[PDB]
Design an enzyme around this catalytic site. Structure first.
Site, PDB file in Angstrom:
ATOM      1  N   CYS A 234       9.954  -0.410  -2.368  1.00  0.00           N
ATOM      2  CA  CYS A 234       9.382  -1.632  -2.930  1.00  0.00           C
ATOM      3  C   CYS A 234       8.378  -1.348  -4.055  1.00  0.00           C
ATOM      4  CB  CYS A 234       8.705  -2.465  -1.827  1.00  0.00           C
ATOM      5  SG  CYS A 234       7.864  -1.491  -0.548  1.00  0.00           S
TER       6      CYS A 234
ATOM      7  N   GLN B 206      16.142  -3.778  -2.410  1.00  0.00           N
ATOM      8  CA  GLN B 206      15.797  -2.393  -2.113  1.00  0.00           C
ATOM      9  C   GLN B 206      16.581  -1.833  -0.935  1.00  0.00           C
ATOM     10  OE1 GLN B 206      11.719  -3.821  -0.757  1.00  0.00           O
ATOM     11  NE2 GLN B 206      11.887  -1.883   0.365  1.00  0.00           N
TER      12      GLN B 206
ATOM     13  N   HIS C 252       3.594  -4.009   1.719  1.00  0.00           N
ATOM     14  CA  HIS C 252       4.822  -4.306   0.993  1.00  0.00           C
ATOM     15  C   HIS C 252       4.484  -4.670  -0.445  1.00  0.00           C
ATOM     16  CE1 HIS C 252       9.089  -5.180   0.805  1.00  0.00           C
ATOM     17  NE2 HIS C 252       8.803  -6.302   0.173  1.00  0.00           N
TER      18      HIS C 252
ATOM     19  N   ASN D 185      10.164 -10.757  -4.749  1.00  0.00           N
ATOM     20  CA  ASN D 185      10.411  -9.733  -3.748  1.00  0.00           C
ATOM     21  C   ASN D 185      11.669  -8.965  -4.133  1.00  0.00           C
ATOM     22  OD1 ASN D 185      10.177  -8.241  -1.392  1.00  0.00           O
ATOM     23  ND2 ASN D 185      10.158 -10.012  -0.027  1.00  0.00           N
TER      24      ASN D 185
END
Length: 212
Positions: free
Chosen positions: A25, A19, A156, A176
């Protein structure tokens, strides 16, 4: 339920993405859950556009955070285009409505703190979750089942792509969007059924997943 689940080994998870600095995110998490859902249901792997969500999803804050739940609602109402048609430019831009390549029908929210219901859903698909990321331990993680300190608050958006055990320590496999130099080629193994309420780093606080 299976002892172990790893959707990465089932040909339905695209490579780790990055990102950058933009707080997008939530778009990465929503896209990742939809891509795998389409792979599971249609045996079709099609890379979807984070950028459309970032630019066009109206409940979120662009590069300053947002809602994967509302992103699911957006895709259910408006459809979503491909990453090839609408690539990620690392910042919010003009909202474009291009030819859409996929829909979903809706989404579901998992009750707070219910890792057992979470495991049931992860055994069927990829799930969007939020974690407490703002700590040196979490940012600097490289390998192993994470045992370090979390951030103070859920901040997050990430995904759970499976679960397993090493040396009798249960873990979730977390995707992630910080690129492959973070963690285990971009992923983290985070304790499962842990002694942290809400899950380790809050992973079970606000889980949600798309409905085909």
């Amino acid at each position: 339920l299976p002892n172990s689940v790893d959707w990465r080994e089932k040909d339905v998870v695209f490579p780790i993405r990055n990102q950058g600095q933009c707080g997008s995110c939530w778009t990465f998490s929503a896209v990742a859950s939809i891509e795998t859902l389409i792979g599971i249901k249609e045996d079709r792997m099609i890379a979807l556009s984070e950028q459309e969500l970032l630019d066009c999803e109206r409940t979120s804050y662009g590069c300053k955070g947002g809602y994967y739940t509302d992103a699911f609602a957006y895709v259910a109402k408006k459809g979503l285009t491909s990453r090839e048609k609408y690539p990620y430019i690392f910042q919010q831009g003009q909202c474009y409505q291009k030819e859409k390549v996929v829909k979903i029908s809706g989404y579901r929210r998992i009750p707070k703190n219910d890792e057992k219901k979470l495991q049931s859903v992860v055994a069927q698909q990829v799930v969007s979750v939020g974690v407490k990321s703002k700590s040196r331990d979490f940012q600097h993680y490289r390998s192993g089942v994470f045992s370090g300190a979390c951030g103070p608050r859920v901040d997050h958006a990430v995904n759970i792509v499976g679960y397993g055990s090493e040396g009798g320590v249960n873990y979730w496999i977390v995707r992630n969007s910080w690129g492959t130099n973070w963690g285990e080629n971009g992923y983290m193994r985070i304790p499962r059924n842990s002694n942290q309420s809400g899950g380790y780093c809050g992973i079970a606080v606000q889980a949600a997943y798309p409905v085909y």
